[PDB]
């Protein structure tokens, strides 16, 4: 064929350290004072963001 | 006096930062300092600082 694969850039080799908050990473937002995890859930037809209690 | 973290952000072994909030627990008393609401008769508008939970 004659297709060209344009190679964009998303992250450098130096920025891939696991000791850093990297773009695209996945984390949970724990609340220290209330000791609860931030959550978003479907409640009554509309999604709502809240702090779940356990 | 032990300096202890009133906030959950700071834990034992961390370095204190000016402007934060802490708790002062005497070594022997084991009860944090408390600013009671008992006004002193001698001087008006002055409360009392006592070691208690």
């Amino acid at each position: 064929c004659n297709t060209s694969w344009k190679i964009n850039l998303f992250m450098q080799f130096r920025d891939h350290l696991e000791e850093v908050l990297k773009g695209g990473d996945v984390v949970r937002l724990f609340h220290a004072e209330q000791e609860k995890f931030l959550t978003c859930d479907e409640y009554k037809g509309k999604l709502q963001v809240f702090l779940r209690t356990t | 006096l032990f300096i202890q973290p009133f906030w959950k952000l700071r834990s034992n072994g961390d370095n204190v930062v000016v402007g934060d909030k802490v708790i002062l627990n005497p070594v022997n008393a084991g009860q944090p300092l408390h600013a009671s609401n008992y006004e002193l008769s001698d001087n008006a508008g002055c409360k009392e600082v006592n070691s208690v939970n």
Binding site: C40, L47, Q48, V49 | L9, D14, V17
Partner: peptide, 29 residues
């Protein structure tokens, strides 16, 4: 309700709006 708070958090499908940008500030030095 504006309660003491003026705005409340909510989930929005689109992400190209300027209402979804958040800055992170540190708690220590």
């Amino acid at each position: 309700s504006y309660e003491k708070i003026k705005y409340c958090l909510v989930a929005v499908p689109h992400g190209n709006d300027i209402a979804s940008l958040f800055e992170l500030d540190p708690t220590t030095l």
